[PDB]
Amino acid sequence: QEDVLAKELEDVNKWGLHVFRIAELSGNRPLTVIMHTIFQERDLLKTFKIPVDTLITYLMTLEDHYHADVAYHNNIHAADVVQSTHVLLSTPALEAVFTDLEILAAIFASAIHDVDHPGVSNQFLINTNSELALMYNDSSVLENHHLAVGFKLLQEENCDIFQNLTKKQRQSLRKMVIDIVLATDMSKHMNLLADLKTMVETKKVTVLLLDNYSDRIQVLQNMVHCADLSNPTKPLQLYRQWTDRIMEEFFRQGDRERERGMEISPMCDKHNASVEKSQVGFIDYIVHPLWETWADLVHPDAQDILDTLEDNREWYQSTIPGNQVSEFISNTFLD
Ligand SMILES: CCc1cc(Cc2ccc(CC(N)=O)cc2)nc(-c2cccc(Cl)c2)n1
Ligand SMILES: [Cl-]
Ligand SMILES: [Mg+2]
Ligand SMILES: [Zn+2]
Ligand SMILES: [Zn+2]
C-alpha cells in the first residue's frame, strides 16, 4: 500500500496526477496526503514553523468536512484543485514572482475552497430560501460558507497551522484567501476573465513582472479559478470521470427539485440530458476562453494544456449520439 501510494505521489508536480488512484490508496484521504506532500516539497512547514502533527490534524479535520457522498464537490475535487494550483504556481513565467506567504495563501485557499459543499448550487439555496442563503443574504452563499468553515476549523484541537505566522502575515494571508475563494463563485467568471484579459494586454516581462498587490492577487484569483475549471484540460480518462461525477451531482439536485414540485434546473434533469453536447458548450464558451487567456499570460508555458483541451473537445464532439446549455451558462457564469 505505502510503496504504491508513494510511487503515485512522485507525479505530484505533473498535470495529470492519478488523483482517483491516490484517493483509493490513501483510504479516501487524497486531500491530506496531497497537501502534506506539497507542504513538504515547498518547505512550507519550515518557513512558517508549522508543526507536522498540527498540519496533519488540520488536514484530516478539513478533509472530514468535505462530504464524501457528494459526487463532485468532495475531498477528491479539493485535492485536485490543490494539486492543480501547485502545478500552476511552478510555471516558468511565474518563477520567483510570489512570496512564500502568497504561495501558502493560494494552496490553502484551494484546499478549503469547496469545504462543506452540500452538492446543490447557490441558486438552489437561494430559490429554496435555505438557511445558508438567509445567513449570507443571497450573495456568494456557498463561497462565504466555505471560507467560514475553512477558517473556523483552525480553532479545533491542535489545528492552528498559522499559529507561528506574525500578526501581519496572518492578516495578509486571511485577506488573500478570502479574495481567492470569493473569486471561485462561478457567477464572477465573466468579470474575472474580462479583468484578466485587460491585465494580459498590459503585461510586462523580464518571466512576468507583478508590481502591486492588485496585480498579484488578480493572478492568484485567476490561477485558482483556472484550477477549479481545469478538468477538461486533463488527460481524457480523468476528465471523463469528472464529467460523470458532476452530472451525477447535478441530477441529484434535479431529483430534489422534482420532489419539491420545482421546475427542474438546466443540466439537472436526468430524463432530458445531453452530456457530450453540454461539455462541448462548457469548453467553447467558458473553459477554452479562460485557458487561452491564461496561456497568453504565461506564454508559452500552457501550450500543452490548450492542446489537450482541444483534443478533449473533439472527443466529446465526436461522441454526441440548447435552451439547456445556454440557460445553464447564463445562470451560472454571469453576475
Ligand atoms: C467537467 C466537470 C464540470 C465542471 C463544471 C464546473 C462547475 C462547478 C460548479 C458549478 C456550480 C454548481 N452548480 O455547483 C458549475 C460548474 N462544469 C461542468 C459543466 C457541465 C455541464 C455543462 C456545463 Cl456549461 C458545465 N462540468
Ligand atoms: Cl486516477
Ligand atoms: Mg465552489
Ligand atoms: Zn465539524
Ligand atoms: Zn471547486
Author numbering: 254 to 459, 463 to 577, 593 to 606
The article reads:
PDE4D allosteric inhibitors bind in the catalytic site and complete a hydrophobic surface that allows closure of the amphipathic UCR2 regulatory helix in which hydrophobic residues are oriented towards the catalytic site. Closure of UCR2 inhibits the access of cAMP to the catalytic site and consequently enzymatic activity. PDE4 allosteric inhibitors share a common pharmacophore that allows the compound to engage UCR2. A central aromatic core is clamped between a pair of hydrophobic active site residues and donates an electron pair to a hydrogen bond formed with an invariant, active site glutamine. The central core is decorated with a pair of projecting, aromatic arms denoted as Ar1 and Ar2. The key phenylalanine selectivity residue projects from UCR2 into the active site where it makes an edge-to-edge or edge-on π–π interaction with the Ar1 aromatic ring and a face-to-face π stacking interaction with the aromatic Ar2 ring. By contrast, subtype-selective PDE4D allosteric inhibitors are designed to accommodate the phenylalanine while clashing with UCR2 containing a tyrosine (i.e., for the PDE4A, B, and C subtypes) as the tyrosine protrudes more deeply into the active site. X-ray crystallography shows that the binding pose of BPN14770 to PDE4D in the allosteric site highly resembles that of BPN5004 to PDE4D.
